[PDB]
Structures are given as C-alpha cells and as structure tokens.
From Swiss-Prot, chains A, B:
Subcellular location: Cell inner membrane
Job of this protein: Essential inner membrane component of the type IV pilus (T4P) that plays a role in surface and host cell adhesion, colonization, biofilm maturation, virulence, and twitching, a form of surface-associated motility facilitated by cycles of extension, adhesion, and retraction of T4P fibers. Controls both pilus assembly and disassembly and plays an important role in PilB localization to the complex and ATPase activity.
Protein name per its UniProtKB record: Type IV pilus assembly protein PilC
Complexes and interactors: Homotetramer. Interacts with PilB.
Transmembrane domains' residue ranges: 26-46
Disruption phenotype: Deletion mutant show missing type IV cytoplasmic dome and disc but the cytoplasmic ring is still present.
Family: Belongs to the GSP F family.
Gene: pilC
Record-annotated disulphide pairs: none
Amino acid sequence: KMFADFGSELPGPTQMIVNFSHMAQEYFFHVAGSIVAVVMSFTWSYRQPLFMPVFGPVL
Amino acid sequence: KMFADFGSELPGPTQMIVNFSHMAQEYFFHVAGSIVAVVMSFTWSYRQPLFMPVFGPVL
Amino acid sequence: FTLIELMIVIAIVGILAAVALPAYQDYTARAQVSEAILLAEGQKSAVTEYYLNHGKWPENNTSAGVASSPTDIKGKYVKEVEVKNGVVTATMLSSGVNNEIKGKKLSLWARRENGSVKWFCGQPVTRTDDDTVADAKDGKEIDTKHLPSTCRDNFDAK
Amino acid sequence: FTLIELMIVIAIVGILAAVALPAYQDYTARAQVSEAILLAEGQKSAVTEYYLNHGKWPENNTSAGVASSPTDIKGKYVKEVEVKNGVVTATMLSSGVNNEIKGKKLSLWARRENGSVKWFCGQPVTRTDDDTVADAKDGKEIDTKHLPSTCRDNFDAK
Amino acid sequence: FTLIELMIVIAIVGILAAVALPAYQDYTARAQVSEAILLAEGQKSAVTEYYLNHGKWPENNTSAGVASSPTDIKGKYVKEVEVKNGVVTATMLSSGVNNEIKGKKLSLWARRENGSVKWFCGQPVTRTDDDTVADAKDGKEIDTKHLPSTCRDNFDAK
C-alpha cells in the first residue's frame, strides 16, 4: 500500500479522476494480492504453531 | 513524502504560492518526523545486529 | 475505500437538474404564452377603433385593418393571430414551445361600454352577438396554469 | 496499513472540481454572453424609432441618439456596443470573460415590416441595403454554443 | 498483532473532516454573503426609480419606498439592509453565519450615467455628494475573500 501510494500513474493503477467505484474495482487485483499475502502468513503462523512405501508417514 | 504529495491543502501544509523558504520551514515538522523515523530504524538495525560479583557477566 | 465525493456531487447536480426541470419547463411555457398575449394585444387598437367608428365588430383582420393574413401576425411561439368578429385569438406555434401548449391558443374580446369598450383576456372564445361571446370549447385552449393572473377571464366576464 | 479514506476523498473532490470545471466554464461564458445581449437590446428603441420616423436606419450611435461613443456602451464583459446602419453589435471585453469568447461579438438587426419592424439576434452581421444584411464573416463571432436559443438567427432570417 | 485497518481508517476520516473543515467553512461563508448581496439588490429598483424621477438619491428606506424599517429587510444571515442616500448596505446577522463575517457588511451604490445609472457592489461605502461615495472604513467590512468576483468594486469605480 506504501509503494502504491507513491503518487499516481504507477503500474496497473488508475488516474484519480475516475469514479471511485471503478477505481477501487480495477485495483481489486492489488487488494487481492494483499489478502493472499495475509492468508499465507496466517497459514504459516497457524500451521506451524512411484515408490508407494516412501509415501507412508514413518515414525 | 508521498501522502504529503497527494495535492495541496492537506493537514499542516502550506499553499504553494508562499515563498519557498517559509513553506519549507513550516513543514520542518514533517522533515523532522521523517528523520526521527530514520534514526529509529537505524537504531533497531545497529543495536540489534553492593555485591560486585553479582554484576559481572557470567556464562 | 475512498472516492464518493466526486460520485455523489455529480449525482446531486444530476438530480438538481431533474428538480429544476419542471420549474424551468412551466416558467418557460408561461413565458411563451405571455407573448401570445402581447401579439394578441396592440391589435386591440384596430379593433376598438373599428367598433367605435362603425358600431360593428371587425369581421376579420382586413376589416380591422391589420395584416390581411392571420399568419402574418405570427411570432416565435405564435403561429398567428386572427381577428374573428372583434375577437382576437392567438395560436401557439408547434416549434420552439413547451409541449403542452403548442398549437394551443387564447382570445381577447371586448364589450360595448357604450361610448367605449372594455377588453378581456382568457381562453379561446367565439362571438355570438355584438355583446356576447362563448367558450370556443374544443380542446386546444391554453391550460389555465399557463395563463397570467391578468388573463383568467371567463366568457361571461363583465 | 490504514489511511486511505482521507487520501481518496481529497482526490475525489479534486477530480470533482475537474468535472465541474467545464460545466461552470460554459455556464459561465453563456452567462457573460447573455449580457452582451442585454446591452445590445434597449438600444433597439432608439434604432426602431429612428427608422420609423425617417425610413432610414441610423448610421451610427449618435444618429440613433445614444452614447455617441461605442465605448460608452460597455459593461463588465462588454467592451462596447456600436450601431452601424441600424445593426447593433456588442463586443466582449478581454478581461473578466471566459476564454474563447473575449473580443468576440454578436449583432441585433431589424427588418422593415412596413409600419413596424421585427428584430433578430445572432452572430455578427453587416448591413447591405435597407432591408438586407450579411454575415460579418471574419472570425470574431461568438460561437453558437455560447448563444441563447433566442439568439440563433441567421443573416437571412425573416 | 493485528487490528490497524479499523484504527487508521477511523483516523483518516477524522483528518479528512479536518481538511474538509476550512473548505466547507469558506464555501459556507461565501454562500452566506452571496445572499446579503441578493437582499441588497432588488432594492436597486426603488433606489434607481427614486433617483431618475427626482434627481436626488433616496435618503433612507422610507424615501426609497421600502420597509421603512432597516430590520424589516433582514434574512437568515442578514440582520438588515439600510438605504442611506442611495447607498444600500447589507448587514450580516450574528447567528447562523461563518465566524469572521457576522455583524459584517457590504454596500451597493450607483452613479449617475445621465439618463440612467450604473450600479456597483463591494465593501461598505458612504455617500459624499450625489456622484461620490467613499470607504466606510471602520473595520466591519466583509473580507475580500468572502466577496464574489462580481462584488469587488472600489469606492471610485466608474
């Protein structure tokens, strides 16, 4: 959100004069890449606190 | 710097028509809050990589 | 996340135009009728004189001594003005007017005061006898709402 | 981490002003022209009378019996108003106006109705003969978009 | 550990209101002054007629033929409107207005054009002679920033 707030006309943005709803929906890409980033670091924090025989859980 | 570059007439700014020296001196607040931010992250990076016998570093 | 000030203010000016639409649309029509009235008048002179000099109402424009052709007394919103037995009727054009007033008209008629006459202004009327007219009831009268307070006269006004 | 409500709403009011910019800029110009028209009119009286009394159009302001000096009939957006052979032209100032209408002008001219005259309003015109004018084609005419619906008359309007 | 999206977005709307505060506060005042101006006008008629008919400026409201009582020409933000020798001054109420414009006022005055008059609008003025007024310098004038572009006239505007 910090690199994407360094002004206007970045990679993938819009100009600020669009209507807000369209601007927010196009960025949906980046809102999504942030949520996925969150889900991942949550997964690592939640978890974390053919040779058929090779596939069995051993001791 | 990039939120404070979203246009003019934010919280604490000036209008652009002032004389430059006065504009820059009023913002001195924000130039200062940025340097302090720097000093802090530098401190965290530098640090972070009578019974006389009781005071000695042990094992 | 943010941009609603631009979206609402573009949509308040849009609805502001919709609220300002009927106000400008009757103010407008009421303005186009106020002229049919001005075009109708000023022809009172001819008609008055004709009556006082002869004691008979002018049968038509030519008699009254005005543009022998009704269509020659037209305007922007006025398609014409015809004198029919002292009664002067003004017709609203079809182009350049409101929407519920085009092709619609009003009338100005007078009454013998004896030595002089008095004029009336209102919805279309027909002359019966030298001192009596009646509603030209037919459906093309300019609606009361579009007529000035000074032109609300009834067929039997005295 | 947080603050986007202040950033977007300051940037929607910024773009709202950019969208409200051209609307206020033609509403504005269209307003400054509506006056050039009012300054042009009210001088119809002098011109009409001069014509009906003499049968010749007033050559200039003094003839029409108005501020002998064109520049004496100016306004806020009007740099002047000149009567040239019955044709009354209004010039838009250079300061205090739109941007594509300054130094630009319109004309009001009339036509013999025979016993009376009828007035027209539109883009600059020159008088040829006592009953004919023509486009003062030259490039300084106020653009059609800035002219009222009541001032869209062509050089040959009758 | 987590919750900063709610904390920052409540604090960006808080600072958004602080940035939107001075904009709505001069837009607001500038709006309350635009009315003092409308209340001042429409009284030009009385004053103009009085002057043209008599050649002397109306001494007070009663002379001009308007609510003999200044306080009778008040409004929401207007505490009154007084005519003092053709000069019409509008006072801003004390309740319901900005903060740096209450109890403050402006003036409308005219000048003999000879056969007609021209009106001016600006900061309070006093009339000296029939064709000269001067700054009612005293400290209660509505600040230039709150006055329309159409009401920036100086005591010696011609």
